Design a protein around this motif. Structure first.
Motif, PDB file in Angstrom:
ATOM      1  N   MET A 167      38.288  33.587  48.234  1.00 37.78           N
ATOM      2  CA  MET A 167      39.037  32.420  47.899  1.00 37.78           C
ATOM      3  C   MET A 167      40.669  32.737  47.813  1.00 37.78           C
ATOM      4  O   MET A 167      41.400  32.031  47.938  1.00 37.78           O
ATOM      5  N   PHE A 205      34.747  45.399  47.084  1.00 37.66           N
ATOM      6  CA  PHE A 205      34.638  44.144  48.195  1.00 37.66           C
ATOM      7  C   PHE A 205      33.571  44.487  49.261  1.00 37.66           C
ATOM      8  O   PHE A 205      33.053  43.762  50.001  1.00 37.66           O
ATOM      9  N   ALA A 265      34.996  35.344  45.081  1.00 37.68           N
ATOM     10  CA  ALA A 265      36.108  36.368  45.422  1.00 37.68           C
ATOM     11  C   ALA A 265      35.645  37.362  46.666  1.00 37.68           C
ATOM     12  O   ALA A 265      36.593  37.957  46.978  1.00 37.68           O
ATOM     13  N   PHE A 281      43.245  35.643  41.156  1.00 40.18           N
ATOM     14  CA  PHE A 281      43.089  36.034  39.741  1.00 40.18           C
ATOM     15  C   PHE A 281      44.078  36.753  39.133  1.00 40.18           C
ATOM     16  O   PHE A 281      44.676  37.693  39.607  1.00 40.18           O
ATOM     17  N   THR A 285      41.754  35.524  34.911  1.00 40.85           N
ATOM     18  CA  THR A 285      40.562  36.580  34.922  1.00 40.85           C
ATOM     19  C   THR A 285      39.742  36.263  33.536  1.00 40.85           C
ATOM     20  O   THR A 285      40.063  36.632  32.494  1.00 40.85           O
ATOM     21  N   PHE A 286      38.705  35.605  33.500  1.00 42.66           N
ATOM     22  CA  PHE A 286      38.090  35.366  32.518  1.00 42.66           C
ATOM     23  C   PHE A 286      36.781  34.435  32.736  1.00 42.66           C
ATOM     24  O   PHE A 286      36.630  33.283  33.267  1.00 42.66           O
ATOM     25  N   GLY A 287      35.508  35.160  32.523  1.00 40.87           N
ATOM     26  CA  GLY A 287      33.991  34.588  32.731  1.00 40.87           C
ATOM     27  C   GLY A 287      33.240  35.104  31.545  1.00 40.87           C
ATOM     28  O   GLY A 287      33.615  36.028  30.951  1.00 40.87           O
ATOM     29  N   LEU A 288      32.290  34.184  31.448  1.00 42.80           N
ATOM     30  CA  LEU A 288      31.470  34.376  30.113  1.00 42.80           C
ATOM     31  C   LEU A 288      30.234  35.022  30.318  1.00 42.80           C
ATOM     32  O   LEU A 288      29.963  35.935  29.779  1.00 42.80           O
ATOM     33  N   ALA A 289      29.498  34.570  31.139  1.00 43.63           N
ATOM     34  CA  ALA A 289      28.024  35.058  31.519  1.00 43.63           C
ATOM     35  C   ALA A 289      27.600  34.951  32.785  1.00 43.63           C
ATOM     36  O   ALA A 289      28.482  35.382  33.795  1.00 43.63           O
ATOM     37  N   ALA A 300      29.644  33.860  35.877  1.00 46.71           N
ATOM     38  CA  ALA A 300      30.857  34.633  36.205  1.00 46.71           C
ATOM     39  C   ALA A 300      30.604  35.571  37.192  1.00 46.71           C
ATOM     40  O   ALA A 300      31.376  36.280  37.899  1.00 46.71           O
ATOM     41  N   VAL A 360      22.513  40.482  35.617  1.00 48.77           N
ATOM     42  CA  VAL A 360      22.861  40.983  37.049  1.00 48.77           C
ATOM     43  C   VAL A 360      21.285  41.663  37.261  1.00 48.77           C
ATOM     44  O   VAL A 360      21.160  42.157  38.384  1.00 48.77           O
ATOM     45  N   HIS A 367      34.480  42.981  30.307  1.00 51.92           N
ATOM     46  CA  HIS A 367      32.989  42.464  30.682  1.00 51.92           C
ATOM     47  C   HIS A 367      32.640  41.282  30.160  1.00 51.92           C
ATOM     48  O   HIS A 367      31.647  40.902  29.959  1.00 51.92           O
ATOM     49  N   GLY A 368      33.774  40.407  29.918  1.00 52.34           N
ATOM     50  CA  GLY A 368      33.636  39.025  29.492  1.00 52.34           C
ATOM     51  C   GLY A 368      33.813  38.646  28.016  1.00 52.34           C
ATOM     52  O   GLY A 368      34.630  37.854  27.547  1.00 52.34           O
ATOM     53  N   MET A 378      31.202  33.702  40.340  1.00 46.06           N
ATOM     54  CA  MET A 378      32.642  33.651  40.701  1.00 46.06           C
ATOM     55  C   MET A 378      33.158  34.814  41.202  1.00 46.06           C
ATOM     56  O   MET A 378      34.081  34.662  42.103  1.00 46.06           O
ATOM     57  N   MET A 379      32.701  35.934  40.845  1.00 42.13           N
ATOM     58  CA  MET A 379      32.900  37.038  41.602  1.00 42.13           C
ATOM     59  C   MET A 379      32.523  37.171  42.895  1.00 42.13           C
ATOM     60  O   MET A 379      32.963  37.862  43.903  1.00 42.13           O
TER      61      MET A 379
HETATM   62  C1  LIG Z   1      40.644  41.927  39.692  1.00 42.11           C
HETATM   63  C2  LIG Z   1      40.673  40.923  40.461  1.00 42.11           C
HETATM   64  C3  LIG Z   1      39.549  40.337  41.319  1.00 42.11           C
HETATM   65  C4  LIG Z   1      40.082  39.157  42.190  1.00 42.11           C
HETATM   66  C5  LIG Z   1      38.212  40.616  41.388  1.00 42.11           C
HETATM   67  O1  LIG Z   1      38.088  40.702  42.791  1.00 42.11           O
HETATM   68  C6  LIG Z   1      37.269  39.963  40.690  1.00 42.11           C
HETATM   69  C7  LIG Z   1      37.147  38.432  41.043  1.00 42.11           C
HETATM   70  C8  LIG Z   1      37.254  39.972  39.192  1.00 42.11           C
HETATM   71  C9  LIG Z   1      36.439  40.259  38.443  1.00 42.11           C
HETATM   72  C10 LIG Z   1      35.517  41.574  38.613  1.00 42.11           C
HETATM   73  C11 LIG Z   1      36.030  39.539  36.978  1.00 42.11           C
HETATM   74  C12 LIG Z   1      36.672  38.329  37.146  1.00 42.11           C
HETATM   75  C13 LIG Z   1      36.357  37.594  35.570  1.00 42.11           C
HETATM   76  C14 LIG Z   1      35.723  38.203  34.568  1.00 42.11           C
HETATM   77  C15 LIG Z   1      36.491  38.721  33.386  1.00 42.11           C
HETATM   78  C16 LIG Z   1      34.357  38.311  34.448  1.00 42.11           C
HETATM   79  C17 LIG Z   1      33.402  38.792  33.362  1.00 42.11           C
HETATM   80  C18 LIG Z   1      32.354  39.688  33.780  1.00 42.11           C
HETATM   81  N1  LIG Z   1      32.832  40.808  34.378  1.00 42.11           N
HETATM   82  C19 LIG Z   1      31.950  41.800  34.923  1.00 42.11           C
HETATM   83  O2  LIG Z   1      32.318  42.842  35.372  1.00 42.11           O
HETATM   84  C20 LIG Z   1      33.774  42.921  35.939  1.00 42.11           C
HETATM   85  C21 LIG Z   1      30.754  41.713  34.442  1.00 42.11           C
HETATM   86  O3  LIG Z   1      29.962  42.731  34.554  1.00 42.11           O
HETATM   87  C22 LIG Z   1      28.524  42.726  34.291  1.00 42.11           C
HETATM   88  C23 LIG Z   1      30.198  40.546  33.689  1.00 42.11           C
HETATM   89  O4  LIG Z   1      29.112  40.513  33.055  1.00 42.11           O
HETATM   90  C24 LIG Z   1      30.995  39.642  33.278  1.00 42.11           C
HETATM   91  C25 LIG Z   1      30.538  38.531  32.560  1.00 42.11           C
END
Ligand SMILES: C/C=C(/C)[C@H](O)[C@H](C)/C=C(C)/C=C/C/C(C)=C/Cc1[nH]c(OC)c(OC)c(=O)c1C
Ligand SMILES: CCCCCCCCCCCCCCCCCC(=O)OC[C@H](COP(=O)([O-])OCC[N+](C)(C)C)OC(=O)CCCCCCCCCCCCCCCCC
Ligand SMILES: CCCCCCCCCCCCCCCCCC(=O)OC[C@H](COP(=O)([O-])OCC[N+](C)(C)C)OC(=O)CCCCCCCCCCCCCCCCC
Ligand SMILES: CCCCCCCCCCCCCCCCCC(=O)OC[C@H](COP(=O)([O-])OCC[N+](C)(C)C)OC(=O)CCCCCCCCCCCCCCCCC
Ligand SMILES: CCCCCCCCCCCCCCCCCC(=O)OC[C@H](COP(=O)(O)OCCN)OC(=O)CCCCCCCCCCCCCCCCC
Ligand SMILES: CCCCCCCCCCCCO[C@@H]1O[C@H](CO)[C@@H](O[C@H]2O[C@H](CO)[C@@H](O)[C@H](O)[C@H]2O)[C@H](O)[C@H]1O
Ligand SMILES: CCCCCCCCCCCCO[C@@H]1O[C@H](CO)[C@@H](O[C@H]2O[C@H](CO)[C@@H](O)[C@H](O)[C@H]2O)[C@H](O)[C@H]1O
Ligand SMILES: CCCCCCCCCCCCO[C@@H]1O[C@H](CO)[C@@H](O[C@H]2O[C@H](CO)[C@@H](O)[C@H](O)[C@H]2O)[C@H](O)[C@H]1O
Ligand SMILES: CCCCCCCCCCCCO[C@@H]1O[C@H](CO)[C@@H](O[C@H]2O[C@H](CO)[C@@H](O)[C@H](O)[C@H]2O)[C@H](O)[C@H]1O
Ligand code: SF4
Lengths: 156, 98, 115, 105, 172, 83, 318, 69, 257, 96
Positions: free
Chosen positions: A46, I149, A40, A53, A26-30, A33, I90, I40-41, A36-37
């Motif tokens: 996925m 979801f 999911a 995750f 669980t790790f996204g930057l901008a 990401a 977003v 949030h990242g 990537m959600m």
């Molecule tokens: C719980 C398990 C899962 C499978 C969930 O279904 C999904 C797939 C995981 C999630 C929600 C996040 C996955 C990685 C991550 C840390 C993302 C960064 C992020 N996250 C944000 O919000 C959550 C933002 O909000 C504006 C962001 O800008 C950013 C950059």
């Protein structure tokens, strides 16, 4: 030989288990990401490929670099990667991660996450569509399928 | 039975040695006071069972009842000792020499 | 004897899976992998420092109520006595003072966590 | 007691389960109920100092039933003398002591 | 199986030896659980059941609280373990030597009185009503509700007062 | 007598757990007093025969102690069969 | 022949534990409008075995700051106590017949809290210590009520034997005379097993992974096998106690089949609950259990003490 | 669809019935076609020990009826 | 009687209240992020903690500072437009509009009547996009994962409107100074209408799970209370203002398009 | 329904306990004989074993009283195989 054959099928067996259970961190930057959600999200799910995750780098197999890597965040990305147990794979996703992208010439951006960690798969796009990432993820499973660790151990 | 009481009684002595020989933490000395309660409870329980004295089996329970209260009161005091010096070291409790 | 056998069998399985987990994988140890985890940055201090317990009063009140369970657990045997009036009266009082003790702590902000 | 209040009020708060031969639930005698009941009746009314000498027979029997020092001693001697004979080769236990009896009933 | 009770009491002894050397209360709370468990098995071997499981139950909740207090009030940077300090490690090893010596010695000068190694097992259960029905320790412990009701008054009052006692001790 | 109803309605609205707890606590202390079965609880426990009913020597002045268990004398459990 | 009987307990349970991980991921899926696993084998049936194999080929972690003795002991204890909770369960005849089975279940369950505590403390990490001190808080919350609830139900049963609950419920579920305690019992089991909305020790949202954040590979696998075994057991226990399956002395196969159907259904409701609610705050978990359940449980304890007395309904000792 | 959950739910079901059925049958197979004798109190344990002694093969479950007197 | 060893003893205090050298107050300092499911990242939230009580919050930002404002200086007013897609990534088309209205003001030009309706149309699609992300990821942190979801299927459909006008699911680069880049493809307003007629049912299902739930209310009620006057003095805006009762909305007070 | 079913179980227990009472005389008669033979069989072996030990009185009691004192398990199975002894100490408690 018989042993060399058995080693081959044992190689397929261990690969298959790693192909079928990829646990990205669980790790996204901008903005990458966000897509990537969406991968999911229900449409692509996925999870149906065995992709789950997990928050902790100890429990994660794959690190997907989904966004810009700045100099301030570069040491921290490396640290969570080091703490990933091996085997471990990196998917570089997006122009920012691939090579800097829109910020290549910025004083504060790492010009590609592959200066910091070894990268297995590069996914182009700004952002890549969730399918593009999915194609890249499924291209990582085929890379694992071609793994030949046990056979190479036999020929040592 | 003979061999069991000797081992149980020596178990009580070791905890009395532990209680009487402090180290740093006051919490560790509190756990030895629970080593003693456990030894006494097991002796009483074995005594009552061996002699078939059912009317004495309430007594081992009261020992546990009146041993918890000490553990509670002991832990409550350990909170006040920590709120003063930030640890539970016994060497801090020495103001009363004067 | 059975109850001893079944639990060694349980222990041996848990041990056996523990050994396979450590001696089967290919391990590559280095300092940066084996450091503690803290969201990507170095820890600023050891994790062995004091950790304030905001519910400590409830913790020790659990002990007092825990032993009051030990007094109610003989009841299934106690409802077999001829002295039913006595058994019941003692039971009602016991539960009622546990309740009265609980009400006092509740009204004294004892169940509230210290800020 | 120091304040015989229970005796004065005629109640019994803790006087009724002082010793082994006291009343037990469901009329289950305690181990050595016979001996203790004898010793307490022997030493009743004559006082502690007289009882220490004049009820020594009752007490030493109760003490033997409760702790069984002589019984373990005696059974230790029989088994240890039999150990010695069997090492020499002058005694082989009976079938009913070696696990081959004809069980009763 | 003739050494069974002797071994449980020997394990119990060590658990209190380790406890007496007083390492970090994280491990002192671990010895009380294992001694609590060992001691529970002794009361079971001698025929108990309710008394065995209760002392195990009660000491499981006590060490839960004690753990919470250790991490908050009795924790230092380098918690001590039985092997942490050579001097404690010496007395834990030496302590086990002594019992192997005391048992062997005292067994030599009496042979029956205290430790009767020659006759372990022969003297565990003395009597037992073979056709009984009402013999569980629960029935004896349950007498507090009819016969020894005084036991329960003092026990209930002890706990009732304790709530008032601790609320005042810890009050700000 | 008038304010209490306002309070009880208030508590019942916003604190039913306590209103249920007091009611059940207090209803459990009344029910033994008024039930016409509370007396049998002792009787049934006394009628359960764990120990052996040790017979007594018949001196000759026992005109209300059965000789054989199937005699028309002695304690009877008809009230329990038809309970 | 007794060793073969262990095999037909510990193996079916372990297989059933694994597929619970698959059923969880697919029920959560369809509840979220997706499909969950369905590629690794026909409808994902091989997905559990892939995850297991992958975890035991993953490099295990030995952090430099960790206390290794307890670090290793904790997962081993976790899975041992999960399997040991099963040997007394009557289905309808238990593997090990204990007079005080209910206490064996209470005592074994409590001792398994120390795998959370010791692992978290032994990790010597801040997030793992936060997880451990929530295990302490969570246990202090549900322990007092859970034992008393059992006491209330067992005063209609007559003993602490689990096998006597089969006979108590010969003509009626205990769910009817006891549905208030079943409601409170059910919520306790969610707290006992760290299940949502009470997954506070793990709690990925607030703590990265709580007590097992420093665990990878096979040692981390053992913790999960323990978590999901407990789910089946606690719902299996709830099925025996409150939803008594049909028992005919001539058809012991009937009791097992009915027992399984209700145990599966209750296990599903754990997965159903996880998909439906937000997570409690662990301070609010204490307030739920001490300020709502506990006042009700004490009253029901006093209700059920008196209830057999004024109906002459005392259960038999045997 | 949702019924694709059943293949795993059915496996889990078969697995949870093997414990109960296997234990019931194993008890009959090791106790002469009878339920494993339960001994809660000392009296029942005495009956088993007496049955073991009068059987003639040192097994409590080999019952002897009026054939034997 | 003085003796050499007790020569350092002092008389006790007159009221038994012994002055103590001030005790060290140390709180647990914890890193909460960057790699953390709730950060949030790229938030390195450094928290000072007493137990689990938060004493100080010290947000360390800059882990996603990429020099966008310096990079903009080496670009034209058109080359710079896509940087605004990647700010609030977003709320893409809302960011493009903010940049578009600025340059139009400086250019002194007006976008035509239809493009203003396209920009308000997509301006409000993006708000529904942004509020789904805000609401469900907020509910995801609290522990309720199902609504995420449900609504990210609705987001997948709104991404389809972004792609059918611009050719990109997120970074549309569609709102431009002077108007919009291309006209709506035929048949796009039907699909937007088909989505909109059904979307309020989706909001209903999420609300059925959160609004009246007692576990949601307990996690959110009385939490993060901000008073009106402190909202204004801290620079808050939007919902952070209107949550505290302040009646302000730039769409109402300083309307554009 | 719990009430009506618990009352029925109380009658069933009374029937099952009355069965035991009808049989205790037979068990008590057998217990006496079984115990008396086992004590007599140790006495017939002490005489053999300790013939040539000075100052040994075979069968000597350890009690001043001449009341019948029931034997302990250690007195009773002490000259038999350890399996018998382990059975008497743990036979009931370990059966599960
Ligand atoms: C719980 C398990 C899962 C499978 C969930 O279904 C999904 C797939 C995981 C999630 C929600 C996040 C996955 C990685 C991550 C840390 C993302 C960064 C992020 N996250 C944000 O919000 C959550 C933002 O909000 C504006 C962001 O800008 C950013 C950059
Ligand atoms: C633990 C239980 C092990 C049993 C599972 C191992 C078998 C894995 C292969 C499988 O099940 O799927 C077929 C898999 C599926 O192939 P696949 O993984 O490439 O296909 C996936 C992509 N789709 C969905 C489009 C099909 O076949 C294989 O390619 C792997 C075969 C390896 C078999 C292992 C060697 C034999 C064992 C010695
Ligand atoms: C559940 C259990 C799943 C296991 C199923 C059987 C598969 C066992 C395959 C080995 C497990 C994977 C270990 C691994 O990947 O290392 C490969 C290793 C690495 O090969 P290597 O020796 O050439 O690597 C040298 C180190 N490097 C590459 C870093 C320079 O190969 C082995 O030695 C495995 C031997 C396999 C024999 C089976 C028993 C092993 C124990
Ligand atoms: C199931 C796993 C059991 C088989 C592997 C045991 C590993 C081992 O100890 O190798 C022998 C050891 C070597 O242990 P090792 O360090 O190479 O263990 C690593 C296992 N592989 C190779 C698969 C990564 O031989 C010795 O030198 C000492 C004996
Ligand atoms: C960590 C290791 C796992 C720990 C398990 C903790 C839970 C064990 C609780 C104790 C079990 C118990 O309560 O004993 C019950 C049983 C007595 O049987 P009973 O209830 O009287 O009914 C039949 C008698 N006719 O007991 C018996 O039948 C005999 C005593 C069995 C004791 C079991 C001990 C477990 C094994 C521990 C090994 C050490 C671990 C290292
Ligand atoms: C002799 C073998 C039989 C078993 C022996 C062990 C019995 C149990 C004893 C428990 C008490 C230990 O006794 C111990 O005494 C030492 C001094 O020697 C004191 O300990 C103090 O001094 C020692 C010596 O520098 C330090 O290592 C220690 O950290 C400090 O606290 C404590 O008071 C107590 O911890
Ligand atoms: C300080 C804390 C105090 C708060 C708690 C107070 C609890 C008080 C409870 C009083 C209830 C006792 O209720 C009482 O029950 C007994 C037996 O159960 C009944 O007694 C009846 O049944 C018994 C057997 O069951 C018969 O042997 C007896 O002859 C008959 O009177 C009384 O008729 C009833 O009045
Ligand atoms: C935590 C550590 C626990 C370890 C505890 C120690 C475990 C070992 C138990 C030692 C106790 C004595 O253990 C064993 O006891 C038996 C009888 O019980 C002694 O005696 C045995 O041999 C003697 C002859 O010497 C014979 O009379 C007979 O065969 C038997 O009594 C053995 O000489 C001794 O080996
Ligand atoms: C001021 C502080 C103290 C006030 C609070 C304490 C008040 C006392 C309450 C406890 C009452 C105990 O009450 C006491 O119970 C015991 C048994 O339980 C009764 O005692 C009875 O014991 C057994 C019953 O099987 C009989 O063998 C015995 O002969 C009989 O006396 C007493 O007759 C009664 O007085
Ligand atoms: S490549 Fe594009 S979409 Fe991905 S993080 Fe960089 S700017 Fe955002």
């Amino acid at each position: 030989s018989r042993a060399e054959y058995v080693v081959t099928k044992l190689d397929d067996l261990i690969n298959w288990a790693r192909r079928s259970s990829l646990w990205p961190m669980t790790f996204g930057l901008a903005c990458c990401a966000v897509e990537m959600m969406h991968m999911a999200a229900p449409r692509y799910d996925m999870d149906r490929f065995g992709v789950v995750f997990r928050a902790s780098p100890r429990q994660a197999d794959v690190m997907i670099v989904a966004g810009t890597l700045t100099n301030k965040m570069a040491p921290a990305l490396r640290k969570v990667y080091d703490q990933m147990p091996e085997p471990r794979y990196v998917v570089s996703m997006g122009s920012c991660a691939n090579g800097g992208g829109y910020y290549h010439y910025s004083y504060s951006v790492v010009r590609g996450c592959d200066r910091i960690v070894p990268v297995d798969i590069y996914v182009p796009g700004c952002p890549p569509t969730a399918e593009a990432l999915l194609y890249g993820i499924l291209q990582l499973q085929r890379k694992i399928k071609r793994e030949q660790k046990l056979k190479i151990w036999y020929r040592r | 039975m003979p061999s069991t009481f000797f081992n149980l009684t020596m178990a009580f002595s070791l905890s009395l040695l532990g209680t009487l020989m402090f180290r740093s933490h006051l919490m560790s000395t509190l756990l030895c006071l629970e080593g003693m309660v456990l030894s006494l409870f097991i002796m009483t329980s074995v005594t009552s069972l061996n002699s078939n004295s059912m009317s004495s089996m309430p007594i081992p329970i009261t020992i546990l009842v009146f041993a918890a209260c000490e553990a509670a009161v002991g832990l409550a005091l350990l909170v006040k000792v920590s709120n003063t010096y930030g640890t539970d070291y016994v060497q801090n409790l020495n103001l009363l020499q004067c | 004897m059975n109850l001893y056998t079944v639990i060694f069998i349980n222990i041996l399985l848990s041990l056996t899976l523990i050994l396979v987990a450590f001696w089967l994988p290919q391990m590559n140890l280095y300092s940066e992998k084996a450091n503690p985890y803290e969201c990507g940055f170095d820890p600023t201090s050891s994790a062995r420092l004091p950790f304030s317990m905001k519910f400590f009063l409830v913790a020790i009140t659990f002990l007092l109520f825990d032993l009051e369970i030990a007094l109610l657990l003989p009841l299934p045997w106690a409802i077999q006595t001829i002295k039913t009036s006595t058994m019941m009266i003692m039971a009602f009082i016991l539960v009622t003072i546990l309740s009265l003790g609980l009400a006092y702590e509740w009204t004294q902000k004892g169940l509230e966590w210290t800020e | 007691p120091f304040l015989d209040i229970q005796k004065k009020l005629g109640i019994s708060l803790d006087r009724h389960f002082m010793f082994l031969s006291a009343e037990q639930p469901y009329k289950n005698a305690a181990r050595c109920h016979a001996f203790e009941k004898e010793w307490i009746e022997c030493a009743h009314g004559i006082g502690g100092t007289r009882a220490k000498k004049e009820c020594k027979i009752e007490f030493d029997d109760f003490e033997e039933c409760l702790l069984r020092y002589k019984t373990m001693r005696r059974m230790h001697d029989i088994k240890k003398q039999r150990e010695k004979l069997m090492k020499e080769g002058k005694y082989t236990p009976p079938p009913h002591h070696s696990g081959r009896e004809e069980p009763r009933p | 199986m003739n050494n069974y009770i002797f071994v449980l009491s020997s394990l119990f002894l060590v658990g209190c030896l380790g406890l007496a050397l007083k390492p970090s209360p994280i491990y002192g709370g671990l010895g009380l659980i294992v001694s609590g468990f060992v001691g529970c098995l002794m009361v079971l071997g001698f025929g108990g059941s309710f008394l065995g499981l209760m002392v195990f139950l009660i000491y499981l909740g006590g060490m839960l609280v004690v753990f919470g207090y250790t991490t908050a009030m009795a924790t230092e940077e380098y918690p001590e373990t039985w092997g942490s300090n050579w001097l404690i490690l010496g007395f834990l090893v030496l302590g086990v030597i002594m019992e192997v010596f005391l048992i062997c010695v005292l067994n030599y000068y009496d042979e029956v009185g205290v430790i009767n190694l020659d006759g372990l097992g022969d003297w565990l259960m003395y009597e037992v009503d073979d056709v009984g029905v009402m013999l569980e320790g629960g029935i004896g412990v349950a007498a507090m509700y009819s016969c020894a009701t005084w036991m329960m008054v003092v026990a209930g009052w002890s706990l009732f007062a304790g709530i008032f006692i601790i609320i005042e001790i810890t009050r700000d | 007598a008038g304010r209490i109803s306002a309070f009880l309605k208030n508590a019942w609205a916003k604190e039913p757990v306590l209103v249920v707890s007091f009611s059940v606590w207090g209803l459990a202390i009344i029910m033994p007093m008024i039930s016409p079965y509370t007396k049998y609880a002792s009787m049934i426990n006394k009628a359960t025969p764990y120990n052996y009913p040790v017979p007594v020597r018949d001196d000759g002045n026992m005109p209300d102690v059965p000789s054989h268990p199937q005699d028309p004398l002695g304690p009877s459990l008809d009230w329990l069969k038809n309970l | 022949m007794f060793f073969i009987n262990i095999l037909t307990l510990l193996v079916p349970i372990l297989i059933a534990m694994a597929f619970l991980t698959l059923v969880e991921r697919k029920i959560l899926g369809y509840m979220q409008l997706r499909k969950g696993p369905n590629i690794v084998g026909p409808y994902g049936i091989l997905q559990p075995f892939a995850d297991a194999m992958k975890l035991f080929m993953k490099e295990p972690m030995r952090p430099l700051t960790t206390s290794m003795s307890l670090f290793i002991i904790a997962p081993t204890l976790s899975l041992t106590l999960a399997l040991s909770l099963w040997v007394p369960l009557p289905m309808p005849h238990p593997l090990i017949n204990l007079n005080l089975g209910i206490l064996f279940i209470l005592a074994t369950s409590s001792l398994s809290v120390y795998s959370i505590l010791w692992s978290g403390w032994a990790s010597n990490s801040k997030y793992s210590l936060f997880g451990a001190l929530r295990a302490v808080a969570q246990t202090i919350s549900y322990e007092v009520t859970m034992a008393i609830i059992l006491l209330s139900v067992l005063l209609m049963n007559g003993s602490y034997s689990l096998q006597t609950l089969i006979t108590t419920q010969e003509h009626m579920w205990l769910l009817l005379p006891a549905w208030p305690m079943a409601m409170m019992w059910f919520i306790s089991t969610l707290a006992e097993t760290n299940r949502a909305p009470f997954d506070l020790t793990e709690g990925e949202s607030e703590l990265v992974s709580g007590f097992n954040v420093e665990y990878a590979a096979g040692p981390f696998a053992l913790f999960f096998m323990a978590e999901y075994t407990n789910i089946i057991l606690m719902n299996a226990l709830t099925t025996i106690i409150f939803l008594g399956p049909l028992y005919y002395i001539n058809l012991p196969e009937l009791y097992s089949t009915n027992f399984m159907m209700e145990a599966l259904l209750l296990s599903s409701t754990f997965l159903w609950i996880r998909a439906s609610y937000p997570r409690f705050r662990y301070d609010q978990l204490m307030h739920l259990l001490w300020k709502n359940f506990l006042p009700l449980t004490l009253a029901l304890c006093m209700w059920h003490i008196s209830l057999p007395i004024f109906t002459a309904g005392v259960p038999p000792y045997m | 669809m949702w019924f694709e959950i059943l293949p795993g739910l059915a496996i889990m079901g078969v697995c949870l019935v093997i414990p109960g059925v296997s234990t019931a049958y194993i008890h009959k197979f090791t106790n002469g076609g009878k339920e494993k004798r339960v001994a809660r109190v000392q009296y029942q344990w005495y009956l088993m020990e007496r049955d073991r002694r009068i059987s003639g093969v040192n097994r409590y479950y080999v019952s002897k009826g009026l054939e034997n007197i | 009687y003085p003796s050499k060893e007790t020569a350092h003893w002092k008389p006790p205090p007159w009221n038994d209240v012994d002055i103590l050298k001030e005790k060290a107050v140390t709180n647990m300092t914890l890193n909460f992020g960057p790699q953390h499911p709730a950060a949030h990242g790229v938030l390195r939230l450094v928290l000072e903690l007493s137990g689990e009580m938060v004493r100080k919050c010290d947000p360390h930002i800059g882990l996603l500072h990429r020099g966008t404002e310096k990079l903009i200086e080496y670009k034209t007013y058109l080359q710079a437009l896509p940087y605004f897609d990647r700010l609030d990534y977003v709320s893409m088309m809302c960011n493009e509009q903010a940049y578009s209205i600025a340059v139009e003001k400086l250019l002194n030009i007006q976008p035509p009547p239809r493009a203003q309706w396209i920009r308000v149309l997509f301006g409000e699609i993006t708000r529904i996009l942004n509020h789904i992300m805000a609401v469900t990821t907020h509910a995801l942190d609290i522990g309720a994962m199902t609504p995420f979801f449900w609504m990210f299927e609705e987001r997948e459909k709104m991404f389809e409107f972004y792609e059918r006008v611009s050719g990109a699911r997120m970074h549309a680069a569609y709102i431009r100074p002077g108007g919009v880049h291309q006209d709506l493809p035929l048949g796009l307003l039907d699909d937007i209408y088909e989505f909109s007629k059904n979307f309020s049912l989706r909001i209903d299902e999420v609300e059925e799970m959160l609004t009246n739930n007692r576990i949601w209310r307990n996690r959110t009620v009385d939490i993060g209370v901000v008073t009106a006057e402190d909202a204004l003095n801290y620079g808050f805006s939007g919902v952070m203002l209107r949550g505290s009762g302040i009646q302000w909305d730039l769409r109402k007070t300083q309307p554009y398009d | 329904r719990m009430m009506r079913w618990n009352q029925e179980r109380r009658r069933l227990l009374i029937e099952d306990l009355e069965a035991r009472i009808a049989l205790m005389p037979l068990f008590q008669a057998e217990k006496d004989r079984r115990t008396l033979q086992i004590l007599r069989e140790n006495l017939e072996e002490e005489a053999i074993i300790m013939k040539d030990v000075p100052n040994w009185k075979v069968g000597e009691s350890v009690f001043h009283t001449t009341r019948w004192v029931p034997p302990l398990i250690g007195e009773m199975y002490g000259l038999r195989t350890k399996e018998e002894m382990s059975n008497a100490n743990f036979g009931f408690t370990w059966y599960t």
